[PDB]
Amino acid sequence: TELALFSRVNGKFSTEFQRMKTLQVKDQAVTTRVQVRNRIYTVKTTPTSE
Amino acid sequence: LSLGFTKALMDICDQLEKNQTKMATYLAELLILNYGTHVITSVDAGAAL
Numbered sequence: 001t002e003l004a005l006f007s008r009v010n011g012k013f014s015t016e017f018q019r020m021k022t023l024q025v026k027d028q029a030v031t032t033r034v035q036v037r038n039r040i041y042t043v044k045t046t047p048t049s050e
Numbered sequence: 051l052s053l054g055f056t057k058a059l060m061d062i063c064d065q066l067e068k069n070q071t072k073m074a075t076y077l078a079e080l081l082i083l084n085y086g087t088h089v090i091t092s093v094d095a096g097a098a099l
């Protein structure tokens with residue numbers, strides 16, 4: 001600010017603004033399935049075959 | 051006894067009467083490899099989970 005009635009009447013407003021908005025989302029999904037089946041039903045050769 | 055079992059058995063017996071020890075003992079070893087070392091006289095028909 002400034003004022004006077006004799007020699008020095010002025011005005012000033014050196015207003016400033018600095019804003020910096022930074023976001024950082026970071027998502028990481030990971031799925032991993034493994035599944036295994038087994039069956040048996042056995043068979044032998046007869047001990048007297050030719 | 052089954053048929054094949056009696057066959058193998060009297061075969062080893064003919065080997066022993068024929069005095070051929072080597073072939074006889076090998077035939078017995080084959081028998082035990084071919085018919086297992088035990089005969090089952092009981093099972094339990096069931097299922098499990």
Ligand SMILES: *[C@@H]1O[C@H](CO)[C@@H](O)[C@H](O)[C@H]1NC(C)=O
Nearest residue numbers: 065066067068069070071072
């Ligand atoms: C069988 O083999 C034995 C041993 O070599 C022998 O003493 C015998 O005379 C053979 N024959 C019979 C019929 O046992």
